[PDB]
Amino acid sequence: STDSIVKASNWRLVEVGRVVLIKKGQSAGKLAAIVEIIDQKKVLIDGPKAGVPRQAINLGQVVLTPLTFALPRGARTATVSKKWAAAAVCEKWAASSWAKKIAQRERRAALTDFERFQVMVLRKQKRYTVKKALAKA
Amino acid sequence: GHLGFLPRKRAASIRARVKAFPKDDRSKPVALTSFLGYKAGMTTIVRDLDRPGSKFHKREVVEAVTVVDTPPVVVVGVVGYVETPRGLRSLTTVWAEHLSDEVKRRFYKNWYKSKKKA
Amino acid sequence: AESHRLYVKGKHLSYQRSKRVNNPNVSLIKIEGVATPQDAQFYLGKRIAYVYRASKEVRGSKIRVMWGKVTRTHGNSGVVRATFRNNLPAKTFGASVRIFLYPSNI
Amino acid sequence: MKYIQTEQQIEVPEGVTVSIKSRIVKVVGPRGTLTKNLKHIDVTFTKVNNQLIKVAVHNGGRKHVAALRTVKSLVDNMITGVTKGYKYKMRYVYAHFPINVNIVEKDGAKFIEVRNFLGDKKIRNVPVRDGVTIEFSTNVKDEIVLSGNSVEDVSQNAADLQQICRVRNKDIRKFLDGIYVSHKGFITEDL
Amino acid sequence: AHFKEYQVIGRRLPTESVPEPKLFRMRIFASNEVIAKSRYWYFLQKLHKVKKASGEIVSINQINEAHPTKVKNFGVWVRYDSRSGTHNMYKEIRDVSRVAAVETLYQDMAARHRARFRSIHILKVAEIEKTADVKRQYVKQFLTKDLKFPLPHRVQKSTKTFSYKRPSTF
Amino acid sequence: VEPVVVIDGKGHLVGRLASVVAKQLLNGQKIVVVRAEELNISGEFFRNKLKYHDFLRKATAFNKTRGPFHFRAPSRIFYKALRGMVSHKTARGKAALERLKVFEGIPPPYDKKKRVVVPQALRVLRLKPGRKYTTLGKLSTSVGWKYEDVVAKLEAKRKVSSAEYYAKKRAFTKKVASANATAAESDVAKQLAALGY
RNA sequence: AGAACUGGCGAUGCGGGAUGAACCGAACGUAGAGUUAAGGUGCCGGAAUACACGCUCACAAAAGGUGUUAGUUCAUCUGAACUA
RNA sequence: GCUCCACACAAAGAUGGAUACGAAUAAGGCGUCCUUGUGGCGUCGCUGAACCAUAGCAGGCUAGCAACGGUGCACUUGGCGGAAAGGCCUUGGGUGCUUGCUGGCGAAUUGCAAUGUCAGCGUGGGGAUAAAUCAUUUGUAUACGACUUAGA
């Protein structure tokens, strides 16, 4: 109890070695990481992994992510690659619930009509089971 | 004259209406917040009074006054008013389930020709 | 089924106009779900049908229609100019215009 | 120039436990617990470990840090406000005109009673708050001690007393007999 | 716009029986070629007595970036005239190229000091090769060690006219 | 997209919300604004109070009866600044300004319908923080609208009733939201996960 | 005051200028489709509640600001006077 | 307002669902821990593109397999909602539905598009109910008006 209550508000922080999800550009939904910081707006992003070319960017175009790793000051392409897989951020990312969502609507987009009909009949059955089982107590 | 009273024209009502009430209090008895009379006659009264320091103190005084005829008054029904963020609003009028003749007569402009089916 | 709608819905807006002179040749249409021109490009050319009622039964049914096409995009937000055969009455600005799906070329 | 980061220093001694809501702060101490709403400050609080707190304006500016340093002073006034407390000794001076000040409680008032300061036939009263300890001091004639936790409140009602005594209309220095605050300090001593 | 930076070389015309003049060279920063040659004449009239027709122009180049992904620091000497004659100025600019700095400088000159594209004359731009030669505090603000800040109260732009979310910054 | 949107005023501004509500009227989407008290405006309380009063001193000389009026209940201030943006002379506007229904608070039966907001008029997003603003209900109370105390009394009623419902509902969901977990991992669930849900 | 030249109005519509003899474009047969000038793109109203970096809280001319941002030149360890 | 006869509508823009805490936004939900906290742990958000609902002649007629569901309608208990409450939940039977599963018969010829469907009611003249008015009287009103009484 004598431990203080001051807390917490832990947010995402610009810093070297932070994977950012680029939301508009030729990337448009990929990952990169922050090599190094220019100023309150402009930064320098890249990863050779997901293909994003290394470039300046104005933070408007790009959303941070919970995920980061460790990385030198002003690293380079090859480096950021080696550290990248070294950190296994792709696994980590895709494991998350977030990336599950992006992948989700991505696929729901691709549903062929007939597929979508499958989805109808199934959800009818599954629904019916949950309703059966529930409301018995 | 004053611009207090505008505009100029007549008071549309023969009986006036009551535009204020004493606030209320929760800890009092149930009190009759007001009453209405009938002014009948003017007159003048002589008297004396206790007003310490005034020049009329303990000193016989004369002034005109007004008399108002006041019948003891009969009560029928109650209406509570809800409060709404517009104004008040009624809920329902209630009554005595026996009414006098005259209050029946308030509900007919033509009493004799009517059917008294009210 | 419950929902037989085969047509996207939409709103009629204005006639094309300058700041002063309107030009009631070509109604301007708002489409539900299109936010952007490259979404429009799909719709250009479908058949819009403005549908309403007449209390005097004409052909044996009181529901009447004007037809027409959808010609070209309008503005960046994806308004789409349509031209009917008999121009929309201007009685209806902001009334629901129906955009069918055919001619169908994909 | 939009400073990218700014922080100022706060230390919470063992004597007091600081508990913070989003921005709203409450200090627990031996004397009394103080509650303050900082919602208008616009700033972030951090703690290193259990003894200490740093106040941070991210992406700073001038006016904004100006507010920060003040909240430094307000958390202080809370800390020093509880344990070491605050003692303000007010002094009602007179020579020819006997002053009657009596701090009385009506309906739970505990307000202050001022009379015959420069010959009044009417009672000039001052309201009072909670969290003020009032005393008519013994061992010193013509003086009164008001103390408490909040600097704001003790000097608040002290200022409110010295300004019920305003002498206008007349000679300014005629009677330097008046109502003053003689002492500004703490309760403890040796804290 | 996007700037491009032109090496420019005048031969300005050799007089009778006089060969091959001194081939003046300048680095102009324009948004396209013709603007450059426009300037190179423009300044070169001033920098000593010549005239547009009297002279000539030879070489033109787009000098690309040296190493475009190296974050670099610069300082810049400006000459710009308002209301009266100029005051030669100096700044530092932290960016990813020469062009990006020059641009940002222009936008700034427009944002406060109020002198337009005719008026501004780049004197010299230089990269700061070591650190600690950086005087301006706002620049070296970012030169610290282990630099971190959050999104200053993230402003999301929703693309509809309705949200049901009561959205939050986060 | 609903037949009738029920829009919330809390945390919004005037000018921006006003414009949007307007244009949406002209395209024929019905609207019921709610909780007008809660509305906000740029500028400190001073500046706004001044502009309003400077609108209170505009009258007609021969007689005030048909001259500039003055309105108080925030619904009516909002309504004003909105109706200025519709053409109410023509039959277009008058047919629009009928599609708009403003309230104060959340009167029935709009409590029980889902409220929405307009992300481009919100204050929290638009205004830069650390900059003065004004709440409407205050201003309107200080221009003579009397009913503010009642409004709170009513919301402190609704919000309680609200909180009860929202409780039970959530509670109920814990069943279903947990129940689904047993219908998970089954074949059909495996598929519905493979078909994109 | 009339001095000169040189335009525009007088005989003249059309887009914009919230409105106008002097302003910005623009030559007038009737129509169809396209593209622009000028001016604009919160709503009234057709068109980006676009993107970007910044500044501020709405003829009087010289000014005062323990305003605000950026610079100029002097000297210590930040100061002074100024410029924008 | 009711009853009778004669004769007229019907026995500013829909087409799945308007799908409900509140409060901050330099922060909050949700689950959970334990003493009940201004607590610990997890986690979520970065779109409603969501969620439910959705098959059957515009949605027929018929066979069962499971399961005691879900759903309609009308009877029906009970309670809540007076800010415009006219809305919501709920209990109990029957009635129909079922697509949770598998059956069998029907559709054209509307001929290759030109929605091609599926939002008791006033008239005018009787009979009757209760009025109200003119008129008449009065006077607190008054130029006319208009207003206040009385006239079973």
The CA–C1' separation of B40 and H138, in angstroms, is 19
F82-109 core/surface letters (b: 16 or more CB in 10 A; e: else): bbebbeeeeebbebbbebbebbbbbeee
Question: Residue E7: enclosing H or E segment and its boundaries?
Answer: strand E4-10
- F160 in the same domain as F126: no
What nucleotide is nearest B14 when CA is compared to C1'?
A: H148
The answer to whether the bond into C40 is cis (omega within 30° of 0) is no
Residue D182 C-alpha from the chain's centroid: 15
> Which tokens go with A117?
């009909």
Minimum-distance nucleotide, CA of A104 to C1': H49
E150/A38 touch (CB, cutoff 8 Å), yes or no: no
Distance B116 CA to H130 C1' (A): 9
CA E72 → CA A32, A75, E44, distances in Å? 21, 14, 30
Whether F77 and F135 map to the same domain: the answer is: yes
Q: Where are the beta strands (DSSP E) in chain F?
A: 4-8, 30-34, 40-42, 100-101, 133-135
- Quote the CA–CA distance of F64 and B72 in Å, as a whole number: 46
- Residues for chain F: how many in total? 197
Q: What is the dihedral of CA D22, D27, D28, D33, to 10 degrees?
A: -110
Residue found by looking up tokens 């700095």 in the block:
E101
On whether the CB atoms of residues D86 and D100 are closer than 8 A, the answer is: no
Tokens of D61: 């500016």
Specify the CATH number for the domain of residue F180: 1.20.5.4280
In chain A, count H helices and then E strands.
4, 6
All partners of chain F with 3 or more CB pairs under 8 angstroms: A, B, C, D, E
Total domains, chain C = 1
Q: Which residues of F touch D64 (CB under 8 A)?
A: 130
Please state the domain count of chain F: 2
C51/H125 CA-to-C1' distance in Å = 43
DSSP A39-55: SSSEEEEE-SSS-PPPE
Contacts F129 to D, Cβ<8 Å: 42
Q: Rounded CA gap, E39 and E29, in Å?
A: 9
Positions of chain G reached by protein Cβ under 7 A: 15-17, 32-34, 42-55, 57, 68-73, 83-84
Peptide bond into E95 cis (omega under 30): no
* Claim to verify: residue F19 and residue F38 sit in the same structural domain: yes
C-beta of residue F155 within 8 angstroms of C-beta of residue F145: no
Contact A75, D39 (CB under 8 A): no
The total number of residues shown for chain B amounts to 118
A6/D17 CB distance under 8 A: no
Answer whether F27 sits within 8 Å of C95, measured CB to CB: no
How many Cβ atoms sit within 10 Å of the Cβ of residue F116? 17
Q: Is E155 on the interface with D (CB under 8 A)?
A: no
Lookup: nucleotide whose C1' is closest to D20 CA: H38
F104, B84: Cβ pair inside 8 Å? no
Interface C:B, ≥3 CB–CB pairs < 8 Å: no
> What are phi and psi for residue C82, nearest 5 degrees?
-120, 150
How many CB atoms are closer than 10 A to CB A34?
Answer: 24
F142 shares its domain with F158: no
Residues of E with Cβ-Cβ distance to A11 under 8 angstroms? 150-151, 170
Same domain, F71 and F130: yes
How many other C-beta atoms can be found within 10 angstroms of the C-beta atom of residue D160?
14
Burial (CB count <10 Å: 0-12, 13-18, 19+), residue D145 = middle
- Residue D50: which of A4, A9, A40 has the nearest Cβ? A4
* Residues ≥6 apart with Cβ < 8 Å to D165: D114, D117, D124, D178, D179
CA dihedral for F184, F187, F192, F194, sign (positive or negative): positive
Residues 6+ apart with CB under 8 A from D3: D57, D59, D60, D61, D65, E141
Q: Write the single-letter amino acid at A87.
A: A
H/E segment holding residue D20: strand D17-20
For residue D179, the distance in angstroms to the closest alpha carbon of chain F comes to: 36
Same domain (yes/no): F161, F104: no
CATH number at residue F9: 3.90.1180.10
Closest CA to F196 of A29, A117, A114, A105: A105
Q: What are the structural domains of chain D?
A: 1-85 (3.90.930.12), 86-191 (3.90.930.12)
A neighbours by CB contacts (3+ pairs under 8 Å): D, E, F
Q: How far apart are CA E79 and CA C103, in angstroms?
A: 64
Burial of B54-78, coded b for 16+ CB within 10 Å and e otherwise, reads: eeeeeeeeeeeeeeeeeeeeeeeee
The CB density around residue D64, as the number of other CB atoms within 10 Å, is 18
Q: Do A126 and F196 touch (CB under 8 A)?
A: no
- Take residue A69 and report the two structure tokens written for it: 């790793």
Peptide bond into C103 cis (omega under 30): yes
Is-contact C27 C69, C-beta < 8 A? Answer: no
Domains observed in chain E:
1-68 (3.10.20.10), 69-145 (3.10.20.10)
D44 in reach of chain A (CB within 8 A): yes
Question: Which domain, by its residues, includes F195?
Answer: 148-197
Instruction: Please report which helix (H) or strand (E) contains residue A32, including its range.
Output: strand A30-37
Range of the domain at C20: 1-106
Chains D and A touch (3+ CB pairs under 8 A): yes
CATH number of the domain enclosing C17: 2.40.10.190
**F8/F25 same-domain check:** yes
Task: Pick the closest to residue D186 from D89, D90, D84 (CA basis).
Answer: D84
Minimal CA separation from B82 to chain F, in Å: 12
D vs F: CB pairs below 8 A: 4
The dihedral built from the CA positions of residue F109, F115, F120 and F123, taken in this order, carries a sign that is: positive
Experimental method: cryo-EM
- Beta-carbon count within 10 A of D82 CB: 21
Nearest nt to the E111 alpha carbon by C1'? G54
CA gap E1, B118 in Å, rounded: 89
* Radius of gyration over every alpha carbon of chain E, rounded to an integer in angstroms: 22
Distance D1 CA to H47 C1' (A): 35
For the residues of A95-118, what is the DSSP string, one character each? HSHHHHHHHHHHHHHT--HHHHHH
Find the helix or strand (DSSP H, E) in which F77 lies. Answer: helix F74-83
